[PDB]
Amino acid sequence: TQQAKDIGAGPVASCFTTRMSPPQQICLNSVVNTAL
Amino acid sequence: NPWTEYMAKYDIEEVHGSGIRVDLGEDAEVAGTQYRLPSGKCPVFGKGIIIENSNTTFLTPVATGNQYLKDGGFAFPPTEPLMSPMTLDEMRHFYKDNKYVKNLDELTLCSRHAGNMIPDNDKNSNYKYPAVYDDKDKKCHILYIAAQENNGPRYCNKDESKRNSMFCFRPAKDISFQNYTYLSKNVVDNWEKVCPRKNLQNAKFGLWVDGNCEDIPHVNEFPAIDLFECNKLVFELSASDQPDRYKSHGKGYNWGNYNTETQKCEIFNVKPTCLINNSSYIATTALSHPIEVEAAA
Numbered sequence: 001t002q003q004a005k006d007i008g009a010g011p012v013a014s015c016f017t018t019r020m021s022p023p024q025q026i027c028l029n030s031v032v033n034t035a036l
Numbered sequence: 037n038p039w040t041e042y043m044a045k046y047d048i049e050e051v052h053g054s055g056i057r058v059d060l061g062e063d064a065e066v067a068g069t070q071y072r073l074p075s076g077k078c079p080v081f082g083k084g085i086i087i088e089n090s091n092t093t094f095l096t097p098v099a100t101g102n103q104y105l106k107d108g109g110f111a112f113p114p115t116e117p118l119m120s121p122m123t124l125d126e127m128r129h130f131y132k133d134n135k136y137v138k139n140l141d142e143l144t145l146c147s148r149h150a151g152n153m154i155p156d157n158d159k160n161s162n163y164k165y166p167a168v169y170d171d172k173d174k175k176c177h178i179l180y181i182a183a184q185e186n187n188g189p190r191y192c193n194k195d196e197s198k199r200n201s202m203f204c205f206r207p208a209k210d211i212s213f214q215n216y217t218y219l220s221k222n223v224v225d226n227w228e229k230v231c232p233r234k235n236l237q238n239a240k241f242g243l244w245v246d247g248n249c250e251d252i253p254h255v256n257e258f259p260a261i262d263l264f265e266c267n268k269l270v271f272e273l274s275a276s277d278q279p280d281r282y283k284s285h286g287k288g289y290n291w292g293n294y295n296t297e298t299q300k301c302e303i304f305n306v307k308p309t310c311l312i313n314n315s316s317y318i319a320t321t322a323l324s325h326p327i328e329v330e331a332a333a
Contacts, residue, residue: 007183007191016153017156026117029113034200
């Protein structure tokens, strides 16, 4: 996991908010594969 | 030096400021972990990612739900409302009301669109996904996976029967990637002025010394059948942030003088500061598109 971070492995995310107003919520239809 | 501003776009350390082959130039905190993020300020023309021993193209969405890992690529999975892929038109519509973004060129718009998504754990809004713009279909593809290279039995597995194991992959330029442009969150909106794009016909990169443009005094010669293959080689040897000890800050073998007659890609790793008029040469960089040439005119 240290070396994963070091190669650019990212955080898991389920939904997102937008940076640009108006703030909007956006969700993945399903969970990203566990092995990431 | 009358060359100073013309040559400003070629000072890749300054105008790009990050890895090119692998760009992981910044860190973004999310719940106390510093994730590595692409951060280069220039578009990387023609770069894509190759998944080794695989038919999976990297713009395929990441595996979600019941899919195998090795069946998905790198791109955002489907969302509601659907954020990726998004065509140029869709983006112009979606961002029509935004003063800063609405009228951006397609590449910067694609970068700002990818950088619009805050992951739900990212209380501080640090994390911005990179993107790939495909200018044939005119579609922006947000990349869920920011990683660009992973090799060695340690961290990936090439076995096509183990479909939930991590795939190996590497960045590349390839004729099939000609229409792809790889975009960090930091792509500047004036990249057209301050970043390389076109290969310079009838020109050889040089160094300005005491009133004269001198040849690059030491280069690393690779044979190459054409300009495309030279650009590919320069890309392979260019600034890389792949394992702030691991950051290149844009330092590397980023420039090439391609001699079309001897078919030599003359590759070097210091910023050039002038041009020499030589009908045998085309001046390329790892950032430049591997096809487009600017007329000697």
